[PDB]
C-alpha cells in the first residue's frame, strides 16, 4: 500500500 | 470468483474492501490515473453476486533519469501500489492470483523486480509476500503519515519489499539483510  | 480489469463504474463498489484497516482509500483522481496509464494492471476480483471482493493496482516504471547516479535509483521495475482482499474471502488464493498476474506482466516487460511498500506492523501482508518470494530490501523511515496501532506515534516505517524477476540473473537488486538498511522518505520519488 502506497502512502496517501 | 472472476478476475477482470477495473472500470470506472467500479468506483462505488470498493467500499467493503476499503473498510480494511491496512487498505488506504485514495482520492478518486488517483484510481482514475492508474486506470488511464496502466489499465491492464488495475484488476478486480468479483464474486458470483457481482460484489468486488479484491483488487490490485500496479505500474511499470523506473526512477526519473535525473537520479540515475543516486545509489537509491530504481531501474525498470513493476510496483504494487495497492492490493486488498475482503476479509471474508481471504486464504482462498485471491491475493496470490492477483499478484501472480501482475508478476506475469512484469516478467513479459523485462522488469528487474516487483516491489511494494508495507507497514512494518502489517504482519499478515509481510507473511503473504514472504511466502511468494518477496524479501525486505530496505526500511523507509516515516514513510506512512500515521501509525496503524499507536496514535501517539506520528508516523510508521515501511518495508520496501522486492521479488526478483528473471532479468536479475546476478540478484543484484535484492539483499539478505534488508531490515538493516534504512533510508529517508526523501529518496522515494514520483
Ligand atoms: C500495499 O498494498 C502492499 S502491503 C499491503 C497489503 N494489503 C493489505 O494488507 C490489505 C489487507 N489484507 C489482505 O487483503 C490480505 O490479507 C492479503 C492481500 C495480504 C492476502 O490475501 P489472500 O488472503 O487472498 O492471500 P492468499 O493468496 O489466499 O494467500 C497465499 C499465501 O500467503 C500466505 N498468507 C496469506 N495470508 C497470511 C497470513 N495472515 N498469515 C500467514 N501467511 C499468510 C500463506 O502462505 C497463503 O497460503 P495458504 O495455502 O496458507 O492459504
Residue numbers in the entry:
A (entry chain C): 2 to 5
B (entry chain A): 2 to 191
The publication says:
The NatB-complex, one of the major NATs, is composed of two subunits, the catalytic subunit Naa20 and the auxiliary subunit Naa25 (formerly known as Nat3 and Mdm20, respectively). NatB acts on substrates presenting N-termini with the initial methionine, which is retained and directly acetylated, followed by an acidic residue (MD-, ME-, MN- or MQ-). During N-terminal acetylation, an acetyl group is transferred from acetyl coenzyme A (AcCoA) to the α-amino group of a polypeptide. Our results show that CtNaa20 is active towards a canonical NatB substrate without CtNaa25 in vitro, however less efficient than in NatB.
In order to characterize Naa20 on an atomic level, we crystallized CtNaa20 in complex with the bisubstrate analog CoA-Ac-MDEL. The structure was solved in space group P 21 with two molecules per asymmetric unit. The structure could be built at 1.57 Å resolution, revealing the expected GNAT-fold. The high quality of the electron density map allowed building residues 2–190 together with one CoA-Ac-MDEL ligand (with the peptide part M1pD2pE3pL4p) for both protein chains. The β8-strand is a short additional strand compared to other NATs and shows that CtNaa20 C-terminal residues fold back along the β6 strand. The loops α1-α2 and β6-β7 and the elongated β3-β4 loop confine the size of the substrate entry site. The amide nitrogen of M1p, the target of acetylation, is binding to the carbonyl oxygen of F118. The specificity for acidic residues in peptide position two is caused by the H80 and T28 sidechains, which both form hydrogen bonds to the D2p sidechain. The E3p peptide sidechain hydrogen bonds to the G146 backbone, but no sidechain specific protein-ligand interactions are found for E3p and L4p, highlighting that the substrate specificity is mainly determined by the first two positions. The comparison shows that the Naa20 substrate peptide binding site does not undergo major conformational changes upon complex formation, and explains the ability of CtNaa20 to bind and acetylate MDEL without CtNaa25.
